[PDB]
Amino acid sequence: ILDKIFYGVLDQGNGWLYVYETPNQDATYDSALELVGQLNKVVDQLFEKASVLY
Amino acid sequence: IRDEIAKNTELSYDFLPLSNIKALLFFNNEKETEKFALERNWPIVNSKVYFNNQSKEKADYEDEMMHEEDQKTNIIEKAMDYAISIEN
Amino acid sequence: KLEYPHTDVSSSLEARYFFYLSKINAIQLDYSTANEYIIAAIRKAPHNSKSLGFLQQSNKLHCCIQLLMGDIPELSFFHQSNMQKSLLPYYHLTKAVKLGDLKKFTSTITKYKQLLLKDDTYQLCVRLRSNVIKTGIRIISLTYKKISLRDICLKLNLDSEQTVEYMVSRAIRDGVIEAKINHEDGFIETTELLNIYDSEDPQQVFDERIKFANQLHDEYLVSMRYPEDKKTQQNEK
Amino acid sequence: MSLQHEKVTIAPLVLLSALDHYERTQTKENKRCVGVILGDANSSTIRVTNSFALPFEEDEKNSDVWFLDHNYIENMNEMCKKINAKEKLIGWYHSGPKLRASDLKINELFKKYTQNNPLLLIVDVKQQGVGLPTDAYVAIEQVKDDGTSTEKTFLHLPCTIEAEEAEEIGVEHLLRDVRDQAAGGLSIRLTNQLKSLKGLQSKLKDVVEYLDKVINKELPINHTILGKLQDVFNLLPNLGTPDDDEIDVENHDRINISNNLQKALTVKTNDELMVIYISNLVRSIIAFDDLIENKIQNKKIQEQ
Amino acid sequence: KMLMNLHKEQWQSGLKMYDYEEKEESNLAATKSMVKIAEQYSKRIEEEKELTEEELKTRYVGRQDPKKHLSETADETLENNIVSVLTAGVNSVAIK
Amino acid sequence: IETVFVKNIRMLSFEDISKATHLPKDNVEHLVMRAISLGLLKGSIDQVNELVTISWVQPRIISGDQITKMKDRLVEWNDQVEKLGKKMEARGQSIWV
Numbered sequence A: 001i002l003d004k005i006f007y008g009v010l011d012q013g014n015g016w017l018y019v020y021e022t023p024n025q026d027a028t029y030d031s032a033l034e035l036v037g038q039l040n041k042v043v044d045q046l047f048e049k050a051s052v053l054y
Numbered sequence B: 001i002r003d004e005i006a007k008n009t010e011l012s013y014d015f016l017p018l019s020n021i022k023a024l025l026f027f028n029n030e031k032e033t034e035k036f037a038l039e040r041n042w043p044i045v046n047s048k049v050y051f052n053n054q055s056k057e058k059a060d061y062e063d064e065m066m067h068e069e070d071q072k073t074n075i076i077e078k079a080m081d082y083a084i085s086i087e088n
Numbered sequence C: 001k002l003e004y005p006h007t008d009v010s011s012s013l014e015a016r017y018f019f020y021l022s023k024i025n026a027i028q029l030d031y032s033t034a035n036e037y038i039i040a041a042i043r044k045a046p047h048n049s050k051s052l053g054f055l056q057q058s059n060k061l062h063c064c065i066q067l068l069m070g071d072i073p074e075l076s077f078f079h080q081s082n083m084q085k086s087l088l089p090y091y092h093l094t095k096a097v098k099l100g101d102l103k104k105f106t107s108t109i110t111k112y113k114q115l116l117l118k119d120d121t122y123q124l125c126v127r128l129r130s131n132v133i134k135t136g137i138r139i140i141s142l143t144y145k146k147i148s149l150r151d152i153c154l155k156l157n158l159d160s161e162q163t164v165e166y167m168v169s170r171a172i173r174d175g176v177i178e179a180k181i182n183h184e185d186g187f188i189e190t191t192e193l194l195n196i197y198d199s200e201d202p203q204q205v206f207d208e209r210i211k212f213a214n215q216l217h218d219e220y221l222v223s224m225r226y227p228e229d230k231k232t233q234q235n236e237k
Numbered sequence D: 001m002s003l004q005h006e007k008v009t010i011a012p013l014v015l016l017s018a019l020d021h022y023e024r025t026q027t028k029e030n031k032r033c034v035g036v037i038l039g040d041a042n043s044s045t046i047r048v049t050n051s052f053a054l055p056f057e058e059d060e061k062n063s064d065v066w067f068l069d070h071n072y073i074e075n076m077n078e079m080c081k082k083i084n085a086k087e088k089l090i091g092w093y094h095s096g097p098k099l100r101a102s103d104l105k106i107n108e109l110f111k112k113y114t115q116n117n118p119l120l121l122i123v124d125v126k127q128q129g130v131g132l133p134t135d136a137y138v139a140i141e142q143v144k145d146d147g148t149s150t151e152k153t154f155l156h157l158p159c160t161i162e163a164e165e166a167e168e169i170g171v172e173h174l175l176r177d178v179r180d181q182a183a184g185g186l187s188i189r190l191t192n193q194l195k196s197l198k199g200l201q202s203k204l205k206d207v208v209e210y211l212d213k214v215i216n217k218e219l220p221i222n223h224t225i226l227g228k229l230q231d232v233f234n235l236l237p238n239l240g241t242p243d244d245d246e247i248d249v250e251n252h253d254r255i256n257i258s259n260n261l262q263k264a265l266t267v268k269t270n271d272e273l274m275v276i277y278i279s280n281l282v283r284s285i286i287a288f289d290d291l292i293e294n295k296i297q298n299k300k301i302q303e304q
Numbered sequence E: 001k002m003l004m005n006l007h008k009e010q011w012q013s014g015l016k017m018y019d020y021e022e023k024e025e026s027n028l029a030a031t032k033s034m035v036k037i038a039e040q041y042s043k044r045i046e047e048e049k050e051l052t053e054e055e056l057k058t059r060y061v062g063r064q065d066p067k068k069h070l071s072e073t074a075d076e077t078l079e080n081n082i083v084s085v086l087t088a089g090v091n092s093v094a095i096k
Numbered sequence F: 001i002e003t004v005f006v007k008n009i010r011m012l013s014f015e016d017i018s019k020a021t022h023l024p025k026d027n028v029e030h031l032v033m034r035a036i037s038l039g040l041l042k043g044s045i046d047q048v049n050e051l052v053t054i055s056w057v058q059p060r061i062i063s064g065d066q067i068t069k070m071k072d073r074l075v076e077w078n079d080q081v082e083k084l085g086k087k088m089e090a091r092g093q094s095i096w097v
Helices: A027-049 B002-012 B018-024 B030-040 B051-064 B075-086 C011-027 C032-044 C052-069 C076-080 C088-099 C102-111 C113-118 C128-143 C149-156 C161-171 C201-233 D012-023 D070-083 D103-111 D165-174 D186-216 D223-234 D242-303 E020-044 E053-059 E066-095 F002-006 F014-021 F025-038 F064-090
Strands: A009-011 A016-018 C146-148 C179-182 C187-190 D007-010 D035-040 D045-053 D056-058 D066-068 D088-094 D119-123 D134-142 D151-157 D159-161 F011-013 F041-046 F051-057
Touching: A027 D242, A027 E020, B002 B018, B002 B030, B002 B051, B002 C161, B002 C179, B018 B030, B075 C201, B075 D186, B075 D242, B075 E066, B075 F064, C011 C032, C011 C052, C032 C052, C052 C088, C052 C128, C076 C088, C088 C102, C088 C128, C102 C113, C102 C128, C128 C146, C128 C149, C128 C161, C128 C187, C146 C149, C149 C161, C149 C187, C161 C179, C201 D242, D007 D012, D007 D119, D007 D134, D012 D035, D012 D045, D012 D119, D012 D165, D035 D070, D045 D070, D045 D088, D045 D119, D066 D103, D070 D088, D088 D103, D103 D151, D134 D159, D186 E066, D186 F064, D223 F051, D223 F064, D242 E020, D242 E066, E020 E066, E066 F064, F002 F014, F002 F051, F011 F014, F014 F025, F014 F051, F025 F041
Parallel strands: D007 D045, D007 D159, D088 D119
Antiparallel strands: A009 A016, C146 C187, C179 C187, D035 D045, D035 D088, D056 D066, D119 D134, D134 D151, F011 F051, F041 F051
């Protein structure tokens, strides 16, 4: 499960193995993290411009 | 203190025995417990309270008075608001 | 019944105004609105030692506000400020509330009594002896999903199964604990399991974020072009 | 013959040609103009590239008498070959405003010209309809399953347009509208959004009243028409299924991209806010300097 | 009027739509690219404090304005998704 | 097939089917399976929710009764279009350029 080579989770509350083979991670949502990431960096730099006004 | 406790119990429990509702509201007389219940609008039927019935009626009334398109909000309506702001 | 100006006044007035509101709102047991108003007063007010006594009082009130919520300020805050000695009664409070210690809490407000009352946050502070308990039982329900009535009484020195039943009954009307009591088995069970992405709740949040942004466009538009218009009229080219 | 029929692609020159030939006969007061339809066919999409008038008379008192000159059509076709010899007779235009059942009799005559089942094109000259103002039909012979004999009948063919590349730059050339029935910007698409919904309202209303007619006025049941309306129900969406919950979850996804983007645009603008503010700080110096300078200039201009 | 009308998609174009696969492609492309315009804008605005605008644009690639280019790319997909939702929800609510 | 048509929705319990044909629950399932095989109905069979979720029904002829049944359902959907369109008129009344 640590390799992630078939995914799944192991339940010792009854003794089953659930085998989940469903897709992971939304690609679209994930690339939105790097885009926000870059906007959060830029605004510190815009604030360097605004030191001119002060 | 009782009236305060009776809002609480809706959230805490959905089944209580008749002895347990009495205990919790600091009573010692079963007839008084059932008396309060009429007035506080609880339906104790067969010695088990149905807090959930009561919630339904309470929610519905707050919808029932008009305010109501924008109170709810619509999927369609969000996009309309955002649209006009950009083209103004 | 105020109709206070914002577009034509000095920023010193605008800070002072925001400060007053949080104090008055807080005393009426509205800590939600209290919290928004103080952060705005701080941003208006500078970082200098010219404003120094203003900032000290404003930042006292902000720590206390977040404790009254059960929000709790971070450890970051007190360290990165260089105000450590002044905010010392609040610091001890923040550690105290978190731990859920009634025993510690009794010590904290007693030790520091005088310093707190001069700031007139002492009136607010006494209300935390209760919130200290509510935070504490919230710890217990996170650590243990399903937890006996007896176990809780043992950790925080609560008096009966029946007593703790009742503490939790008040606390979950306010939805702090976010749990429900089963009388018929004898446990307190938190009900959170997430998967609220599926639900319409995030949609509601995203809608609010956009409108805070559309409003920022308006501030930008009115300000930007207005001193340009003056300079053209002016004899300078 | 050919049974290949699908769409009628119609060129804009065709549309304009039948309005013109109608107005230069100055036929009105319900008097008609029927001309030839020219183009490619033996083909699934029937492709009408051009059209020309034919001398035609329609009697309005009794509708069962008409004039068609058979001699002209052959001559006329020969001269079409001069223009472009990829054109043969594939049908006829009618001047509208609607279908007539006297069109069934006209139709016979043009089967001794064509290599396809003849084309009927209503060019509405008053330009009425919420989409295109042309309906298109083709004559079919078929048995009727409601227990009655073989009819000759005009069954609907959808109308769409395709045009030459050359024609297409001309259409745009004369025109100068910005369009509100085609999609552009955000605001335009809101106008089209509303138009579509009201369109649906109009057609749907007509269905309810159509149903009303059969059982109270007595239009004949026609199984073929009502049969599609059943399928409207079976392909119909449902609420609270795991399909209609995917539908909500997709809205939550898209709304988040819109949030980042609105916010991206806010970054860009707060930078443009600071920039113009620097421009003002710069222009301040110039402004100061200008006042001391203008002192010297005033006195000189008065001297002269 | 004949000239103007070139569509049977006058009322069959707002409720009509493209699959959500294609909308997932637009969303994914759009977000991915705006990172790249955003990284050029970051190199860029380490300056914007020297002498002459015209110089900065050559040397540190202010050309075409990356500030303008990011606004355009954001505006196009932003307006498009309001439509994509707007048509989506309209169908669900009116049709059923 | 006829029960599905006359209902608005498109799903039936195996209990309802049992009553209507006078069949046991075993034979209710064998009957849906034949019917699909014949190509009268297409859908899904749930034995663990005891549903048949029908997804298409075959066309058929239409008599008087059936005319009215469908007519009525158009009445609701007509209203839904008109009032949803009333809400859209009122927002961005200004923007329609």
